[PDB]
Amino acid sequence: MFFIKDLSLNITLHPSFFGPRMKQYLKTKLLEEVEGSCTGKFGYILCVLDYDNIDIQRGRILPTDGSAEFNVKYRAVVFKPFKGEVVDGTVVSCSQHGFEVQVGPMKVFVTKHLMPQDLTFNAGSNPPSYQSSEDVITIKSRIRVKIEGCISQVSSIHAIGSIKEDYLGAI
């Protein structure tokens, strides 16, 4: 799901970045680290709304090294998967255990055992495709996958989907 949440991050700056323009640098860092990365607590961070009204609060000096620590509160658009969530995706890589569906920035995997019996694996084709009794699952094909479980590891999120139930499969 594509949600919007106010996140807070502690930014560390080197003593060489204490110019009057340092605020800009903050925002710069606040982009370079937050946009594109991922967190196991809020999901894949997509974008960061409100770039002009970014609160800076007050910077504190930690003991050694002399680097500066900041607490920034902002608003960001993030993407977080959920268990048992119907999503759509396109296949990228194919495997004998199942094809790897691509849903946004997340690469969900579908186990072969979590597939109907009529859906069979075909390696003789290029690329290897899953041929069923009516639908042919190829790379560029669009498949509606129902996510059964999700894993929220730090800076790394992988989920498992299935298409065995009704109203699923290729789009």
Residues that bind other proteins (CB under 8 A): 164-166
Best CA proximity match to 161, nearest among 122, 93, 105, 107? 107
> From the CB of 17, what's the least distance to other proteins, in Å?
56
> From the CB of 164, what's the least distance to other proteins, in Å?
5
Residues in the chain: 171
Which one, 52 or 166, has the nearer CB to other proteins? 166
The answer to whether 33 and 9 are in contact (CB under 8 A) is yes
The answer to whether 45 and 35 are in contact (CB under 8 A) is yes
> From the CB of 134, what's the least distance to other proteins, in Å?
18
Token reading at 62: 């930690």
Which one, 112 or 164, has the nearer CB to other proteins? 164
> From the CB of 145, what's the least distance to other proteins, in Å?
16
DSSP E strands in the chain: the ranges are 2-13, 38-39, 43-49, 60-61, 68-79, 85-95, 98-103, 106-110, 120-122, 129-131, 136-137, 142-153, 156-162, 169-170
> From the CB of 116, what's the least distance to other proteins, in Å?
8
The answer to whether 26 and 70 are in contact (CB under 8 A) is yes
Which one, 134 or 166, has the nearer CB to other proteins? 166
Distance CA 142, CA 139 (A): 8
Which one, 29 or 135, has the nearer CB to other proteins? 135
Token reading at 82: 């959920």
Which one, 65 or 165, has the nearer CB to other proteins? 165
